[PDB]
Amino acid sequence: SLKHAVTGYWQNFNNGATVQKISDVPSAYDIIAVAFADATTTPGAVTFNLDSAGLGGYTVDQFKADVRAKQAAGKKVIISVGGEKGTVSVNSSASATNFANSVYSVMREYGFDGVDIDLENGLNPTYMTQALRALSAKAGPDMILTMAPQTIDMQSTQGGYFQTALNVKDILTVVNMQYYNSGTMLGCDGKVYAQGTVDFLTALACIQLEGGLAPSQVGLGLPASTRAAGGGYVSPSVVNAALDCLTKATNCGSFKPSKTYPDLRGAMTWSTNWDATAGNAWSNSVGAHVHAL
Incomplete structure (x- = not known):
């Protein structure tokens, strides 16, 4: 469901994972x-170009139709900006306006429900907050807005992503942090935790849950398989344990949150394509668990 949700990234490119049409994405994925x-030559601006050639000749018309069919089935489909190799910058009023204008143009062209912020080359809260309010003014209160910070971006309420998320809390759907490709990090208790453990999930999610984000605004993002990231993969049972620990105080590791957060949004994975290469094991197990919360 949207209320307890699984977000999955669908690749508009071929990286060796299983190539998929939107219509191939498992039903477990709610977003x-x-x-x-x-990025384009205009500061802050984006565009979307379906990788028809790299995706076995998948056409714009079929992509648009597949998006509409997902929406008819109650799913949301959003455009992600950034990625590891992204070069989008939103660091001025002009680039904030170019971002809002271009993202909304892309949304209207393809029928997307909203946007995911996945800039990995910097996040300026002064200008991204302005950009997101401009975009929200165009798209309205039903817009889906997600963010996929790296762990370094949510270590305190002072992180650029964290400050932005708080500034736009009333229009924010969920922060699906990437609990992977990460060095060691502090948890909300001030102790050092390592990726690939239940405690990294719960102790770092705690910083968000205690730092002004609603439980419905916190999602656990993991790699779908060991092929999907350089580090931080965990078995689905580990993701489900972390979800249990945060929502109902069961299956915790050494780290015990002070509270329970039953409205925790759910989970996220990079990517649906790597999930498919791995037999949909991750979405089968995590999806069933999230949709049973």
């Missing part, structure tokens, strides 16, 4: 984030 919009 599908299309990865990614491209």
Whole structure:
């Protein structure tokens, strides 16, 4: 459901994972984030170009139809900006306006429900907050807005992503942090935790849950398989344990949150394509668990 949700990234490119049409994405995914919009020569602006050639000749018309069909089935499909190789910058009023204008143009052209912020080359809260309010003014209160910070971006309420998320809390759907490709990090208790453990999930999610985000605004993002990231993969049972620990105080590791957060949004994975390469094991197990919360 949207209320307890699984977000999955669908690749607009071929990286060796299983190539998929939008219509191939498993039913477990409630929010599908299309990865990614491209930067342009205009500061802050993006565009989307379906990789028809790299995706076995998948046409714009079929992509649009597949998006509409997902929406008829109650799913949301959003455009993700950034990615590891992204070069989008939103660091001025002009680039904030160009971002809002271009993202809304892409949304209207393809029928997307909203946007995922996945800039990995910097996040300026002064200008991204302005950009997101401009975009929200165009798209209205039903717009889906997600963010996929790296762990370094949510270590305190002072992180650029964290400050932005708080500034736009009333229009924010969920922060699906990437609990992977990460060095060691502090948890909300001030102790050092390592990726690939239940405690990294719960102790770092705690910083968000205690730092002004609603439980419905916090999602656990993981790699779908060991092929999907350089580090931080965990078995689905580990993701489900972390979800249990945060929502109902069961299956915790050494780290015990002070509270329970039953409205925790759910989970996220990079990517639906790597999930498919791995037999949909991750979405089968995590999806069933999230949709049973």
